[PDB]
Amino acid sequence: GLEEEFRKLTNVRIMKENMRTGNLPANMKKARVIQIIPYDFNRVILSMKRGQEYTDYINASFIDGYRQKDYFIATQGPLAHTVEDFWRMIWEWKSHTIVMLTEVQEREQDKCYQYWPTEGSVTHGEITIEIKNDTLSEAISIRDFLVTLNQPQARQEEQVRVVRQFHFHGWPEIGIPAEGKGMIDLIAAVQKQQQQTGNHPITVHCSAGAGRTGTFIALSNILERVKAEGLLDVFQAVKSLRLQRPHMVQTLEQYEFCYKVVQDFIDIFSDYANF
């Protein structure tokens, strides 16, 4: 049953007619995994100076939430030479929340560049990031950063924001979590934070930007639909993500984990059972 659904998800077409920007030779080096790049219709567009060129491109897509269009930004873990773009996207598109679903290294290999300072300040491009708080609590690090856009010198005192990063440590190096609880806590805590910040897009990334990232987005969409309408359709939620960005929810085991977390949620919250 579940194998047959995932085969049909696998059958969702890559719409290469709309993949021109990420396939430009200059932009291919900005992708970590080249088959996982945005469609042009929902790619996150950065600003561009008069001189330098192809700098309007980042491997990132707007992804719809349950209530809201463009609710998430699904992106890859930044590369050393894409870290300035990463923060330019956070700034220009006013993200106040980052959800990180990978370690910097897993199974002895580089999965994501450490784009945030562990202590003190770091400056990437025109943007300075300073960590102010860092609390570990049950497989989730919550980090608060003071983010400052340093240009022009004129408006600079207005150009300060607090960006909060949720770093999930609960996904093992091999396979999928044994329990759904850690993912539900992560989802709950990110949604709580969106109230205080309002409807600014949430930045979600793993390493290549599809597997765990799509799992998180799919589960947030699914659980919010259950709470609002009591209706459940895992297949449609995931397929709809594949229509927005290639390979969202990448492996059969991640699709299994989607169902596990959903069952765990209804086991905790009985008022939603058996509709």
Side-chain angles (χ1 to χ4, degrees), residues 35-48 51-61:
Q35 39 275 9
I36 297 172
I37 49 158
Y39 293 122
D40 288 347
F41 64 71
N42 66 7
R43 83 181 171 94
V44 177
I45 300 173
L46 299 194
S47 62
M48 194 161 44
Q52 199 167 9
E53 150 59 359
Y54 297 129
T55 66
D56 77 332
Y57 173 81
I58 181 176
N59 186 9
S61 323

Side-chain angles (χ1 to χ4, degrees), residues 83-106 109-137 139-152 154 156-178 180-198 200-206:
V83 54
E84 297 181 23
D85 300 332
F86 181 78
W87 284 108
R88 286 173 55 217
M89 175 188 74
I90 306 293
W91 185 269
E92 286 176 25
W93 288 99
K94 292 161 186 60
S95 196
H96 292 65
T97 304
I98 301 181
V99 179
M100 176 163 185
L101 297 163
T102 191
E103 303 294 343
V104 166
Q105 273 185 0
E106 281 164 29
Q109 220 165 352
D110 272 321
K111 281 302 197 143
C112 177
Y113 180 92
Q114 180 163 348
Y115 52 88
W116 73 90
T118 289
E119 221 271 306
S121 285
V122 65
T123 296
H124 297 290
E126 264 162 348
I127 286 165
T128 285
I129 299 102
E130 171 188 12
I131 186 170
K132 301 298 279 162
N133 195 49
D134 186 341
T135 71
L136 175 62
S137 174
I140 304 185
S141 294
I142 303 176
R143 309 192 177 102
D144 288 343
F145 305 97
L146 208 162
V147 182
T148 307
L149 175 56
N150 297 315
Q151 293 295 347
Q156 156 196 29
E157 285 74 31
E158 297 169 292
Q159 322 274 52
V160 285
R161 301 179 193 150
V162 175
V163 174
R164 165 171 297 195
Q165 175 203 48
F166 298 78
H167 194 170
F168 182 62
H169 307 297
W171 201 303
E173 188 176 83
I174 296 296
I176 60 179
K181 170 108 174 306
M183 183 58 65
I184 294 170
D185 291 329
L186 175 67
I187 287 154
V190 168
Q191 192 271 320
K192 222 173 75 205
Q193 164 82 10
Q194 272 305 95
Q195 310 177 320
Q196 181 66 23
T197 297
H200 302 99
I202 305 169
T203 295
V204 183
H205 73 81
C206 55

